[PDB]
Amino acid sequence: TPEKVVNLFTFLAEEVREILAGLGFRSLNEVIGRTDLLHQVSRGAEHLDDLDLNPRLAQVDPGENARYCTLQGRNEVPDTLDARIVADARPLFEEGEKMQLAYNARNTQRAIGTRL
Amino acid sequence: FRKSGDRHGWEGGVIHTLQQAVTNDSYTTFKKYSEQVNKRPPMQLRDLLELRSTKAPVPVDEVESITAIRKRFITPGMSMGALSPEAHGTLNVAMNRIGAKSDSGEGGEDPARFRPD
């Protein structure tokens, strides 16, 4: 039943809200990348395992950029030949009539005829 | 056209070579056509002229595309009275396929053809 999955996700979100409120922040953005809030504790003085998690606790300083994605939309790519074709075969998309085009191809033109 | 008479623009060999080049779709035969047309004695004013530039040649692949040039031609008006409806229709269909313009000429036009097939 979908209600089951909805309830599971709701409980999982409420737990994260509780934990964030207990720490002292008000958003998941304020906690992304903040490694200094994590400490390592040993199991005890009877196991004597020398695990040092510091290699994963290392905090590189970002600089003037933020610690997460700060851009909208996808990463755009340069335009191929197809653009020109879309400029020419307009009666096909406006009326639905047969067309016939000719061009020149070069090996630096990838995905010839995919956007169409 | 006669053997003893003057020279004309459209002779038999020219017509046959053009029709062959356009029926088989072979560019070499069209080049033969152009060679056979542009080598006769001067018959018009534009035969006494010569093209002579001074810049250096460029590769052909950098010249503007075909369609951008084909959209500069048309077919002049030829009324449906003179031509058969078959030829008029074939001209109008063939020109609307490459993006260029065709003509209607005098003598009106069949209204039923105001919509595509």
Contact B70, B95 (CB under 8 A): no
C-alpha neighbours within 13 Å on the C-beta side of residue A10? 6
Q: Which of B63, B66, B67 to probe by mutation at the A interface, max A CB count within 10 Å?
A: B67
Helix (H, G, I), strand (E, B) or coil at B101: strand
Does the CA dihedral B90-B95-B96-B97 come out positive or negative?
positive
Maximum pairwise Cα distance, chain B = 54
Instruction: Decide if B65 and A102 are in contact by the 8 Å CB cutoff.
Output: yes
Q: Which of A68, A61, A72 is nearest to A31 (CA)?
A: A68
Q: Which two tokens stand for residue B110?
A: 């069949």
- Cα pseudo-dihedral B103, B109, B112, B117, rounded to 10: -20
Number of CB pairs, chain A paired with chain B, less than 8 A apart: 30
**Resolution of the coordinates, Å:** 3.5
Distance CA A43, CA A13 (A): 29
- Kindly list the distances between the CA atom of residue B47 and the CA atoms of B9, B32, B43, in Å, as whole numbers in the listed order: 12, 18, 7
What b/e string do you get for A69-78 counting C-beta neighbours within 10 Å, with b at 16 or more? Answer: eeeeeeeeee
Q: Which of A17, A30, A37 is nearest to A67 (CA)?
A: A30
Q: Which of B8, B36, B26, B30 is nearest to B18 (CA)?
A: B30
Q: Which chain B residues have a beta carbon less than 8 Å from that of A95?
A: 116
Distance CA B28, CA B44 (A): 26
Distance CA B30, CA B37 (A): 10
Residues in contact with B44: Cβ distance below 8 Å, sequence separation at least 6, in sequence order: none
Q: Which chain A residues have a beta carbon less than 8 Å from that of B116?
A: 95-97
Distance CA B32, CA B13 (A): 11
Instruction: Decide if A103 and B99 are in contact by the 8 Å CB cutoff.
Output: no
Distance CA A95, CA B114 (A): 12
Distance CA A106, CA A83 (A): 15
Residues in contact with B109: Cβ distance below 8 Å, sequence separation at least 6, in sequence order: B80
Contact B29, B39 (CB under 8 A): no
Which of A84, A99, A104 lies nearest to residue B97, judging by beta carbons?
A: A99
Distance CA A8, CA B98 (A): 60
Q: Does B90 touch chain A (CB under 8 A)?
A: no
Distance CA A14, CA B73 (A): 70
Q: Which of B78, B97, B98 is nearest to B88 (CA)?
A: B78
Instruction: Decide if A103 and B65 are in contact by the 8 Å CB cutoff.
Output: yes
